[PDB]
Assembly symmetry: D2
Homo-oligomer: 112 residues x 4
């Protein structure tokens, strides 16, 4: 699994479950083309977005729909979404920690 | 001023100085239009991006060039940039402070929103 | 002033107001001795805890009472407090800003250290 | 496993390996008694600190030796350690994200 996303909820102290995200790859004309997507599981994790053969070097964007998540909980959020943009050039775990008015994101980059 | 951005360096324990950023506003046709830009001062702050009159309702994007910042310090970071996207002023005018805390493989962003 | 603490609320997107905190300094015999205390203002800041003369070299602890803060807002948080422990002024006097960002099950703390 | 600690390195983008920590339980006389300890594995995780029978209600402190970790990497740290103090009253995952001048800690509290 070349790419995994994990999302946590800092208000409830839990995995952030059923959070939708899309992954985009930067095209030559500077636009973002959809590449993959999914929703986090009960453990707040999203696996299997891509394979090693498909996951080639490039600039990737993970757009996490944090707003819909907070809406479902009845809490006013600040951000429209959380966006993680990076050059891939390895095993990637993107972790996102969510609060209504704040988020943090980290990458744990491992050599398989 | 209604919009201010503060950037901190979590490796050096300092303001993140000379950090470039660009602000966009989502147009009627859904494209991102250039709104404002600047770089952080010696205190890591960027003031005077907009005015109360110009800063109307809408969806705004702040793209902070964190990669150039890390690169100038000799570090190859993970992120291309740090991006903050938010609806502003939909219940009337507010003052927004966007704070970003930077590490080479991680960033945190927070908003302090006050009613003037 | 050489030591300042700023506290923010990540749920409301606001300064964390009226947050109590106590500062300790490690004595020669390794016990924590009371150094200073106070609470955050309307801007979430606590100034005037110490002076350049009093704030000598040593190991300092800031215990921020985050639990009372969350409890007054009707929330049962995870942490008893947020604690910042650090050696100060060991290369000469510095100004320290301690920033804490609070959520019910998470907190982040950063230090901005500047040479006056 | 009633209690797990996970530590990440925000400078290197990796698990924080070989990080020592001690766990204390608050005694009746207000002092901290050692309860358990260990070092994070290659995956930055520390498992098996306690069992369900031993892990009774109380106030617990996890003292993470972040200073020794940064020292080993040749980077000047700000903090003496990272301290996580909480009332236990469930499955606990304490995650700590480390930078030289900053740390964040979150709890992911699960019902088994
Ligand atoms: O450190 C912060 C933070 C901040 C940002 C991200 C974090 O994870 C923690 C604190 C926010 O607003 C500030 C505002 C300030 O005036 C000074 C500061 O040091 C900060
Ligand atoms: O909490 C995290 C974080 C994390 C994210 C943001 C923070 O501010 C702190 C920790 C990173 O990787 C994980 C990885 C995990 O397997 C489990 C976790 O709980 C986390």
């Amino acid at each position: 699994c070349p790419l995994m996303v994990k999302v946590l909820d800092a208000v409830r102290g839990s995995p952030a479950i059923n959070v939708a995200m899309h992954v985009f790859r930067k095209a030559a004309d500077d636009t973002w083309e959809p590449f993959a997507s999914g929703k986090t599981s009960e453990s707040g994790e999203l696996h299997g977005l891509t394979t090693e053969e498909e996951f080639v070097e490039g600039i990737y964007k993970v757009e996490i729909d944090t707003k819909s998540y907070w809406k479902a909980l009845g809490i006013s959020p600040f951000h429209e979404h959380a966006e993680v943009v990076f050059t891939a050039n390895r095993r990637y775990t993107i972790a996102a920690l969510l609060s209504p008015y704040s988020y943090s994101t980290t990458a744990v980059v491992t050599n398989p």
